Amino acid sequence: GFLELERSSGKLEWSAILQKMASDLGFSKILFGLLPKDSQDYENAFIVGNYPAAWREHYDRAGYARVDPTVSHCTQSVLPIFWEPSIYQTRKQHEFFEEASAAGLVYGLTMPLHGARGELGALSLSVEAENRAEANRFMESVLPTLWMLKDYALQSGAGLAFEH
Amino acid sequence: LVDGFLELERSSGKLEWSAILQKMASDLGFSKILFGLLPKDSQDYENAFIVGNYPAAWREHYDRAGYARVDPTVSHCTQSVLPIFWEPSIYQTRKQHEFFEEASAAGLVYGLTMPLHGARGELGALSLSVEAENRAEANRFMESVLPTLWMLKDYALQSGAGLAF
Ligand SMILES: COc1ccccc1C(=O)Oc1c(Br)cc(Br)cc1CNC(=O)c1ccccc1[N+](=O)[O-]
Ligand SMILES: COc1ccccc1C(=O)Oc1c(Br)cc(Br)cc1CNC(=O)c1ccccc1[N+](=O)[O-]
């Protein structure tokens, strides 16, 4: 639980616990990103997780926070956004989909994080699967548990990220 | 839920939105609800956007007694995205004990409050009361529906922000 996240000491232990919870839910890859109130500085977000480091670096270098459609979505909504063909509309967004798929990140969802002190973030989780249909079933069967998890991760994470 | 969300989105205005949300809560097992929402950087609880079916006299009293300064769920909501259950432990001060007695007298004895923190800085709460024989039976019931309610509150927030502002 959150209890586990709260008792942990430091960022390494907290990332290992979150990765495990997410793995227990069927997601082998995650990225928890968090910004303080009023910040839009995506290249200096507090980040936890196990996305391939080269993909994280590429995301930063290419400035993909400008193109990633889950980014504009999180600024407008508290609801999850599933990684579906229909969210990638522009040339640049299709390149995005293609580079992210080359990293293994093809199916998944992004849960926006909106903290009590105005923190802005996302918990993105990717699921390994044969097609869209299978990925959807796996994501749907755990969605109530993920929906709680994202809020526990935010409440715990905000303190990890910003309390020094 | 997603059906409910679209119904909320497709609703005509506050009256139909309130009726839909009330019934979602009722179908899930909760008798009374209160959905409250403030815009970014407001602490004017007396003039929040409010939906629901708490007794009118109770709502009036809460406003006249300045209970937004007392109600322990209000401080809680400004500090967390996690639910606060209406446990004896949350009423710490003398004034909070009086608050509990008055809410209880209104029928509002067991329940929980889900903080709402919107994408544009909206601050709110979805509070739901449950009718039950005693606390242990209420808590059993709340634990069985909590994952559904957790989803519900975010749907209600996102739609409600759209209606209110
Ligand atoms: C504070 O942080 C944020 C705040 C509001 C929103 C996002 C965030 C964030 O964390 O954004 C990032 C950052 Br920064 C780096 C990387 Br790498 C990835 C993301 C988020 N996007 C994805 O994970 C995504 C989404 C869809 C398909 C594939 C992917 N994917 O990347 O594979
Ligand atoms: C924008 O609105 C808000 C914004 C951030 C937080 C709360 C709110 C809100 O809606 O606060 C209110 C308001 Br305003 C009026 C009334 Br009446 C009730 C509440 C909420 N409190 C309860 O429902 C509650 C809680 C525990 C025991 C009994 C009760 N109870 O009242 O029976």
UniProtKB/Swiss-Prot annotation, chain A:
Recorded superkingdom: Bacteria
Organism: Pseudomonas aeruginosa (strain ATCC 15692 / DSM 22644 / CIP 104116 / JCM 14847 / LMG 12228 / 1C / PRS 101 / PAO1)
Name the UniProt record assigns to this protein: Transcriptional activator protein LasR
Molecular functions (GO terms): DNA-binding transcription activator activity; DNA-binding transcription factor activity; sequence-specific DNA binding; transcription cis-regulatory region binding
Family the UniProt entry places it in: Belongs to the autoinducer-regulated transcriptional regulatory protein family.
Phylogenetic lineage: Bacteria, Pseudomonadati, Pseudomonadota, Gammaproteobacteria, Pseudomonadales
A GO CC annotation given for this chain: protein-DNA complex
GO BP terms: positive regulation of DNA-templated transcription; quorum sensing; regulation of DNA-templated transcription; regulation of elastin catabolic process; regulation of gene expression
Keywords, alphabetical: Activator, DNA-binding, Quorum sensing, Transcription, Transcription regulation
Signal peptide coordinates: none
Entry function: Transcriptional activator of elastase structural gene (LasB). Binds to the PAI autoinducer.
Miscellaneous comment as given in the Swiss-Prot or TrEMBL entry: LasR in strain PA103 is not active, this is probably due to the change in position 180 of the sequence.
